[PDB]
Design a protein around this ligand. Structure first.
Ligand SMILES: NCCNC(=O)c1cncc(-c2cnc(Nc3cc(N4CCOCC4)ccn3)s2)c1
Length: 272
């Protein structure tokens, strides 16, 4: 009923790539911010379909979409804190309490997705967004797929993801379970947060850094920068055999996962 409420000004480029572009949109009337993903169809149907299923505090909300010929406009939750990628200091990482809080939020989002039978397939710091309160939100379902339907699991076979984050089974096996692949990429994200370095270009025996890890050479980088408690968790996540790999219910029982480290948000206080 209120005129101009449907008008959005595209004010800043959030991202640009092969997929198209992401723009920060500001409502003409309310000044509400949304991210608008603009896809040049000249995959998107699957992304919209998957987005319509999502409703979780650690998953970028989907508001709807509009088609204007060969161009689709996806109205998505705007995350003002940007990418988790930019919170990782190169060769350092970030404070262990911050990494633990982000890891708890990432596990919350992943448990949710797996619970509704969705696998993200490209978990990495570039796709993990932060809102105004530094809450982590999983974004970009362009590579996502349904791995469970009608309570029946579908084994995956497509090569999807980003090499440094990809699980070794995706490189060595024709078929693989979806869930351990997302668990592995979360372990690589945790490594990046705690060491500000990726451990290997890819999880192959031909890759020295990977062979060194399997040989337990933790006196080497990035492992030497990581405390024994999170390192013990990484030893359980970064397991080559996906059947032996720790599951999320067990990650929630891990000693480091449950270790008190982080104080709550900076609340206003006065003395006397
Ligand atoms: N993953 C690549 C394609 N993107 C998506 O699919 C995709 C899918 N769903 C949602 C989104 C976004 C939502 N909020 C965002 N905020 C944001 C803030 C930035 N900041 C840096 C510049 O100043 C402003 C804050 C920088 C970059 N992004 S991106 C993107």
């Amino acid at each position: 009923a209120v005129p101009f409420v449907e008008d959005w000004d595209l004010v800043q480029t959030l991202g640009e790539g092969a997929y198209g572009e992401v723009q920060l949109a500001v409502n003409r009337v309310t000044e509400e911010a949304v991210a608008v993903k603009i896809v040049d169809m000249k995959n998107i149907k699957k992304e919209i379909c998957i987005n319509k299923m999502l409703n979780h505090e650690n998953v970028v909300k989907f508001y709807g979409h509009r088609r204007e010929g060969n161009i689709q406009y996806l109205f998505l939750e705007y995350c003002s804190g940007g990418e988790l990628f930019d919170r990782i200091e190169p060769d350092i990482g970030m404070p262990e309490p911050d990494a633990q809080r982000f890891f708890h939020q990432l596990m919350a989002g992943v448990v949710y997705l797996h619970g509704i039978g969705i696998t993200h397939r490209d978990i990495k710091p570039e796709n993990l967004l932060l809102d105004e309160r530094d809450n982590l939100k999983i974004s970009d379902f362009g590579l996502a797929t349904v791995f469970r339907y009608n309570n029946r699991e579908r084994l995956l076979n497509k090569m999807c993801g980003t090499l440094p984050y990809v699980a070794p089974e995706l490189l060595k096996r024709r078929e693989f379970h979806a869930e351990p692949v997302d668990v592995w990429s979360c372990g690589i994200v945790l490594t990046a947060m705690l060491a500000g370095e990726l451990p290997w270009d890819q999880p192959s025996d031909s890759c020295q850094e990977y062979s060194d890890w399997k040989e337990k050479k933790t006196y080497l980088n990035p492992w030497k920068k990581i405390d024994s408690a999170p390192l013990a968790l990484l030893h359980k996540i970064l397991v080559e055999n996906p059947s032996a790999r720790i599951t999320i219910p067990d990650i929630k029982k891990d000693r480091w996962y449950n270790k008190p480290l982080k104080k709550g948000a900076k609340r206003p206080r006065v003395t006397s």
